[PDB]
Write a protein that binds this ligand. Structure first.
Ligand code: NAG
Ligand code: NAG
Lengths: 593, 99
């Protein structure tokens, strides 16, 4: 029978897949913690063998017909296995697309903009230009850096994007999708029992509905940031106009977190930084991860494995081997969970340790599931379940409980206001950018935007949605989105938006579970076993069930809700309303100086 | 790769039974004809043990002791402690089952 054949095929497949995936993950780990040519080539052969085996099994798995499979776990496993991805095209088209991706990657990593009239002062983005975007206050230098990187990236990446869109559209239509946007929206598709059905076309309208009510809070934040920047820049910013694109603290305006010194509410009040307290008490990375483990066992989740402590790196090795600075949590398979992080004794690395151990706990919980179902419910759940730990770890209650912060510490409203404003600049400010970018990519892949009117559409929407105007007029020979890392290297961007919604939804659900009686931003989930069990019910599922069922399991709702996000920022929203009475909230679409 | 286990078999094993057969498991309707592929899998799969595995996957050696009694006299009996010998006193003696 077809169902029994699929069961035996999956039983045969899982053990081989787990072995080859472990070999690939171990080779990738060995490259990531020890960078050399031999580790790179070993990783290359391991990934080649694993990918070849996966495609070979996927071609056999596509022979099965899903119309006669009743059990939803086997059907979901076969759905996961049958995603061919880029292999649906012919060898010529796949090779051309891979060539375009590789040239985009190697031209983004070697991006170069150089000083006019000073030819020796040529700057790359990664060491020097990000410092200019984060710290510099000079208008002309930021205008130079933004326009120069836009020119020397957009002019070289416009035709590459022109055939990139066509090849991705061909690949998606070869995989029974309407466009590449629908292929990305198929990651959120859930087929299951009645009432849990979610569709790809639903997602867009859901995002628009959730952006219908974030807009007043974003408008108040934009007005406050515009007023503070007007204080910084006297005549170059208009009261009723949009913000300039190069004054947002980042290269692309993705995060507003670098505007915090310019937009501080109370400069006299310090931040909640506890780095000096860690220095005085002689803390190290081992103590940081031990405190994180103490937090995760206080909430009720299981302890860390012995292999986690034995195999991970928590410090710069300094023995001659190059490592990657980015913290990453690795689920190698067969119960092997590791963290690669060069942990310095700082508050930021402490929160990052909580985030990555949240990733590891998420990986550990679904280990009982089959190999094809050892993933997140969607792309947003995995990062949200680490972001909630990062949220809870940073609270003054958590820092006072573990001795980092003194017992007699006074929490006045001013530190809560400026902390909430910094969180809004990091978190709320990226949401219109994410929504506008994803909407632009979806409409480009769909063909709703005409081919010769790409740029003119994008700068309209940034004037309309993000409320950010271009500093200089750009014609259609530019490719202004393509300067971002995620879009030049073929990465989905809606995961950050869904992460942001799910993070506050999970946080409010856990705080209601833990019976916290105060403001949401002060909430800690420590010493609450019931919240840990409520969380672990979702964490144990993996993607065995539809993501709507997991969302109902945590928050009691089957869709995205931004009421937790507004509830988190409610004191800040009241404060922004209190200081925007005289000013004009909102922006005008036409270019105002 | 020297430790193997049987993943596929037509019927369940009876108690205290072994199966050392290397016949290709025929899961469908078509004959396997000795060649692996689709719906024809080799039943013996390797336990690829590595030291960095999780505690649930590390190799465990198992010895099962099964005790049986038959109509024959039981001849596997545990040691009976022999205490020191005391002479010239009234002591309860147990010498080779003679009490
Ligand atoms: C990194 O790889 C090289 C190449 O095998 C090896 O000699 C070296 O010992 C490795 N580093 C560590 C810390 O093991
Ligand atoms: C949670 O339990 C630990 C266990 O000793 C304790 O040190 C800590 O103070 C507790 N936290 C709270 C908020 O009671």
């Amino acid at each position: 029978l077809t169902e029994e054949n699929a069961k035996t095929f999956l039983n045969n497949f899982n053990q081989e897949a787990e072995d080859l995936s472990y070999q690939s993950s171990l080779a990738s780990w060995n490259y990531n913690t020890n960078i050399t040519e031999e580790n790179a080539q070993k990783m290359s052969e391991a990934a080649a063998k694993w990918s070849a085996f996966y495609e070979e099994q996927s071609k056999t798995a596509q022979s099965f017909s899903l119309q006669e499979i009743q059990t939803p776990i086997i059907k979901r496993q076969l759905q996961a296995l049958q995603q061919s991805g880029s292999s649906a095209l012919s060898a010529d088209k796949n090779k051309q697309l891979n060539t375009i991706l590789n040239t985009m990657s190697t031209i983004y990593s070697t991006g170069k903009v150089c000083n006019p009239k000073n030819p020796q002062e040529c700057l790359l983005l990664e060491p020097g230009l990000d410092e200019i975007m984060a710290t510099s206050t000079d208008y002309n230098s930021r205008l130079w850096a933004w326009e120069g990187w836009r020119a020397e990236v957009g002019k070289q990446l416009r035709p590459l994007y022109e055939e990139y869109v066509v090849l991705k559209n061909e690949m998606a239509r070869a995989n029974n999708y309407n466009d590449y946007g629908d292929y990305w929206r198929g990651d959120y598709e859930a087929e299951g029992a009645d009432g849990y059905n979610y569709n790809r076309n639903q997602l867009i309208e859901d995002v628009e509905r959730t952006f219908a009510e974030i807009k007043p809070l974003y408008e108040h934040l934009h007005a406050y940031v515009r007023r503070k920047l007007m204080d910084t820049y006297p005549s170059y910013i208009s009261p009723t106009g949009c913000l300039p694109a190069h004054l947002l603290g980042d290269m692309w305006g993705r995060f507003w977190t670098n505007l915090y010194p310019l937009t501080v509410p109370f400069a006299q009040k310090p931040n909640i930084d506890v780095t000096d307290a860690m220095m005085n008490q002689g803390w190290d990375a081992e103590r940081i991860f031990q405190e994180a483990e103490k937090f995760f066992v206080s909430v009720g989740l299981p302890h860390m494995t012995q292999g986690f402590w034995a195999n991970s790196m928590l410090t710069e090795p300094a023995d001659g081997r190059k490592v990657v600075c980015h913290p990453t949590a690795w689920d190698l398979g067969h119960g092997d969970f590791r963290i690669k992080m060069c942990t310095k004794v700082t508050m930021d690395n402490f929160l990052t340790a909580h985030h990555e151990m949240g990733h590891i706990q998420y990986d550990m919980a679904y280990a009982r599931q089959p190999f094809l179902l050892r993933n997140g419910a969607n792309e947003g759940f995995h990062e949200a379940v680490g972001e909630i730990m990062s949220l809870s770890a940073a609270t003054p209650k958590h820092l006072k409980s573990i001795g980092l912060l003194p017992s007699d510490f006074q929490e006045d409203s001013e530190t809560e206001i400026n902390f909430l404003l910094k969180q809004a600049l990091t978190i709320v400010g990226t949401l219109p950018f994410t929504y506008m970018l994803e909407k632009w990519r979806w409409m480009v892949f769909r063909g709703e935007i005409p081919k010769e009117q790409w740029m003119k559409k994008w700068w309209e929407m940034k004037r309309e949605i993000v409320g950010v105007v271009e500093p200089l007029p750009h014609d259609e020979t530019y490719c202004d989105p393509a300067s971002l890392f995620h879009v030049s290297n073929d990465y989905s961007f809606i995961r950050y938006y869904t992460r942001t919604i799910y993070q506050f939804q999970f946080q409010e659900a856990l705080c209601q579970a833990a019976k916290y009686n105060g403001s949401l931003h002060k909430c800690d989930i420590s010493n609450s076993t019931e919240a840990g069990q409520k969380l672990l019910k979702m964490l144990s599922l993996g993607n065995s069930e539809p993501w709507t069922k997991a969302l109902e399991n945590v928050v009691g709702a089957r869709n995205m809700d931004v009421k937790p996000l507004l509830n988190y920022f409610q004191p800040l929203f009241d404060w922004l309303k209190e200081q925007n009475r005289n000013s004009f909230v909102g922006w005008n679409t036409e270019w105002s100086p | 790769y020297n430790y193997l286990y049987r993943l596929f078999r037509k019927s369940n094993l009876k108690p205290f039974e072994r199966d050392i057969s290397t016949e290709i498991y025929q899961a469908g309707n078509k004959p396997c004809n000795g060649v692996a592929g689709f719906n024809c899998y080799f039943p013996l799969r390797s336990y690829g043990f590595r030291p960095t595995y999780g505690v649930g996957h590390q190799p465990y050696r198992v010895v099962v002791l099964s005790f049986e009694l038959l109509h024959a006299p039981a001849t596997v009996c545990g040691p009976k402690k022999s205490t020191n010998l005391v002479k010239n006193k009234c002591v309860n003696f147990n010498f080779n089952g003679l009490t």
